[PDB]
Amino acid sequence: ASIPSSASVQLDSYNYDGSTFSGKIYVKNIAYSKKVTVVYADGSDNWNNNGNIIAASFSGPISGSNYEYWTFSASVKGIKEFYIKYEVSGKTYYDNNNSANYQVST
Numbered sequence: 808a809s810i811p812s813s814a815s816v817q818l819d820s821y822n823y824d825g826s827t828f829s830g831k832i833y834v835k836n837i838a839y840s841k842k843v844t845v846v847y848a849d850g851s852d853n854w855n856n857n858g859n860i861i862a863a864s865f866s867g868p869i870s871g872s873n874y875e876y877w878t879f880s881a882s883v884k885g886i887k888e889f890y891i892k893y894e895v896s897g898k899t900y901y902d903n904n905n906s907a908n909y910q911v912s913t
């Protein structure tokens with residue numbers, strides 16, 4: 808029911824199974840073609856040069872607003888933390904939980 812005040816992209820929710828990492832993200836609908844991904848760090852907290860990636864996809868719009876929902880679920884066996892990246896209209900935005908990124912306590 809609650810949504811982002813101003814961010815172009817912001818984390819709705821996330822979860823880890825031990826097996827599987829999933830979640831939802833708030834995306835500001837600024838242009839039609841989008842690219843929203845989650846980039847996480849090693850079970851050893853290694854970023855692999857931003858290479859541990861997980862593509863999210865459009866799930867549904869949020870009525871009464873200029874924001875929408877994207878979802879991500881994938882199989883991951885080792886993960887310490889992550890951040891969210893968003894590209895549209897040649898611009899990039901990020902959700903890095905105010906530079907600390909999101910820790911996954913597994």
Ligand SMILES: OC[C@H]1O[C@H](O[C@H]2[C@H](O)[C@@H](O)[C@@H](O[C@H]3[C@H](O)[C@@H](O)[C@@H](O[C@H]4[C@H](O)[C@@H](O)[C@@H](O[C@H]5[C@H](O)[C@@H](O)[C@@H](O[C@H]6[C@H](O)[C@@H](O)[C@@H](O[C@H]7[C@H](O)[C@@H](O)[C@@H](O)O[C@@H]7CO)O[C@@H]6CO)O[C@@H]5CO)O[C@@H]4CO)O[C@@H]3CO)O[C@@H]2CO)[C@H](O)[C@@H](O)[C@@H]1O
Pocket residue numbers: 836838839840841842865875
């Ligand atoms: O794998 C299949 C498919 O993958 C890609 O498509 C992705 C998008 O990349 C991704 O962003 C997401 O789209 C969501 C979006 O996030 C939501 O906001 C919503 O979209 C709204 C949108 O916000 C509205 O503004 C409105 O869109 C207008 C648009 O503003 C206007 O420009 C025009 O769109 C044309 C566009 O400019 C052209 O580039 C072109 O694009 C074509 C591709 O060329 C063609 O190959 C094929 O993919 O279809 C594309 C779109 O048809 O033509 C566009 C029109 O034909 O008009 C639109 C309205 O038609 O409305 C939409 C809501 O309808 O929802 C979308 C998803 O529903 O998810 C999609 C789907 O996976 C990749 O871009 C695409 O090429 C691949 O086929």
